[PDB]
Design a protein around this nucleic acid. Structure first.
Ligand SMILES: [K+]
Ligand SMILES: [Mg+2]
Ligand SMILES: [Mg+2]
Ligand SMILES: [Mg+2]
Ligand SMILES: [Mg+2]
Ligand SMILES: [Mg+2]
Ligand SMILES: [Mg+2]
Ligand SMILES: [Mg+2]
Ligand SMILES: [Mg+2]
Ligand SMILES: [Mg+2]
Ligand SMILES: [Mg+2]
Ligand SMILES: [Mg+2]
Ligand SMILES: [Mg+2]
Ligand SMILES: [Mg+2]
Ligand SMILES: [Mg+2]
Ligand SMILES: [Mg+2]
Ligand SMILES: [Mg+2]
Ligand SMILES: [Mg+2]
Ligand SMILES: [Mg+2]
Ligand SMILES: [Mg+2]
Ligand SMILES: [Mg+2]
Ligand SMILES: [Mg+2]
Ligand SMILES: [Mg+2]
Ligand SMILES: [Mg+2]
Ligand SMILES: [Mg+2]
Ligand SMILES: [Mg+2]
Ligand SMILES: [Mg+2]
Ligand SMILES: [Mg+2]
Ligand SMILES: [Mg+2]
Ligand SMILES: [Mg+2]
Lengths: 175, 72
RNA sequence: AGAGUUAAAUUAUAACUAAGCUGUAAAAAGCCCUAGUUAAAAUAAAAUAACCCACGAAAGUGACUCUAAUAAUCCUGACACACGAUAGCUAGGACCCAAACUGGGAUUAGAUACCCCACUAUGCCUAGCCCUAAACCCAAAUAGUUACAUAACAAAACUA
RNA sequence: CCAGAUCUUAAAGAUCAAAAGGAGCAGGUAUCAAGCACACCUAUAACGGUAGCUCAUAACGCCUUGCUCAACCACACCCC
């Protein structure tokens, strides 16, 4: 997560010369104080790419787009935490995650070195798509739990059989 | 026109919705009866698992839940 | 999706006048704690603009203001994830008005219907569920062509 | 791919081919959708270690049935 400082000139009114010589009044009118959420995203996107990307001037690169989507994904999550019953934005959040997931897979199969750096910097955790998407109903999860528990119990029966029964035979040898 | 088919499907649904209402409690008895056999048959399936694995008793701490039971 | 707000109508309610007021093709029942005028919260619904055709993936949305905001450098894709009018259920709150059920009146051979009067669930807000429609523009998505050529009807025909 | 049995003989040729294995092909049914130990490593041929394997291109089940024909597969009263 990132936190743009409040008293910073917005993206556009930065490179123009002669700003620091202006009085505090105009600097206040251009800072993030008098700018809406839209201007905040620009500063987040500008800073984020300058920290992880190699060539910021390239926008068509996959890594650049993944950074752009991550900014929107974080923005949607903040909106979702406030407006919980909103369904239009929840759909956007899920589709944005799926698009980033699809683009991360494409980046991995082309440039592994860049994919590793993007995955580490942004904190994204890439999980392989599990085969055979099935709905885990109560009957299946119950029976699966029993089979795993029975499997562990069989190991204990054999493990103690390996210890005690062999020792009993070895008792005759040792005497 | 196609109304000769919608009306035929209208009458059948209207008569079925009266067969359920007239014998509502008969279906209640059968539904609960099938649910008990559904739960019992599930218990035998789990009982078969541990018996064929060589164990004598079910693993400790395992009580089979009643999945086909009314809850909320 | 949140937060704030109210123009026109209606009602509680008060004053004044009047004896009748509602209702139908025609009546009865109901009311007379009523009707007309003046003054007026709350709840609910959003004239004209709209002879415009915009936004959203669909179902949907058209009183005002502010905040947040509408995925993908722009192919296809399920039984997986998310959503889904209206009716219906569970808990709390609201209730002008409309209103299944029910009662009365009338009609009819009968009228547990159409018509008239009263009132409830409910339509509403908050939280959860249900996941159904003629969910129909009965026309699947993405690129295209006007060549070939009229079963009928309709919203002309066709290729990948 | 083929041990083994047999025949011939100058002990290396041939006939039949068990077991085991797989490029592909192989009845109906998904209202059979999950099977429940079905994997692997080390060295041992133990122990120890990892937590995996098959499956919507049909696993696991159920029903019907000799065949793809110089012929092949199976049974020899019944309890495979
Ligand atoms: K209005
Ligand atoms: Mg019928
Ligand atoms: Mg709301
Ligand atoms: Mg009267
Ligand atoms: Mg009055
Ligand atoms: Mg009131
Ligand atoms: Mg329109
Ligand atoms: Mg779309
Ligand atoms: Mg869009
Ligand atoms: Mg797609
Ligand atoms: Mg619904
Ligand atoms: Mg509703
Ligand atoms: Mg409701
Ligand atoms: Mg109930
Ligand atoms: Mg309620
Ligand atoms: Mg009410
Ligand atoms: Mg009323
Ligand atoms: Mg009556
Ligand atoms: Mg519609
Ligand atoms: Mg259809
Ligand atoms: Mg359609
Ligand atoms: Mg499609
Ligand atoms: Mg599209
Ligand atoms: Mg098209
Ligand atoms: Mg003709
Ligand atoms: Mg062989
Ligand atoms: Mg040999
Ligand atoms: Mg030999
Ligand atoms: Mg059946
Ligand atoms: Mg025999």
């Amino acid at each position: 997560q990132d936190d743009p400082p409040p008293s910073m000139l917005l993206l556009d009114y930065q490179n123009v010369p002669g700003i620091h010589k202006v009085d505090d009044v105009v600097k206040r009118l251009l800072s993030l104080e008098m700018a809406n959420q839209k201007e905040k995203l620009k500063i987040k996107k500008m800073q984020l790419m300058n920290k992880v990307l190699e060539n910021p001037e390239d926008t068509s690169s996959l890594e650049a787009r993944i950074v752009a989507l991550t900014v929107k994904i974080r923005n949607y999550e903040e909106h979702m935490q406030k407006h919980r019953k909103d369904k239009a934005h929840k759909r956007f959040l899920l589709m944005s995650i799926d698009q980033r997931k699809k683009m991360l897979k494409n980046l991995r199969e082309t440039n592994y070195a860049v994919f590793e750096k993007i995955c580490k910097e942004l904190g994204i955790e890439y999980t392989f798509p599990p085969p055979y998407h099935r709905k885990a109903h109560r009957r299946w999860v119950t029976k699966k739990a029993l089979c795993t528990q029975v499997f562990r119990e069989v190991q204990k029966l054999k493990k103690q059989k390996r210890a005690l029964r062999a020792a009993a035979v070895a008792a005759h040898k040792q005497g | 026109k196609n109304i000769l088919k919608i009306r035929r499907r209208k009458m059948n649904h209207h008569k079925y919705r009266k067969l359920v209402k007239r014998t509502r409690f008969l279906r209640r008895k059968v539904r609960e009866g099938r649910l008990r056999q559904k739960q019992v048959k599930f218990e035998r399936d789990l009982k078969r698992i541990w018996q064929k694995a060589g164990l004598k008793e079910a693993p400790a701490g395992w009580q089979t839940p009643k999945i086909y039971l009314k809850n909320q």
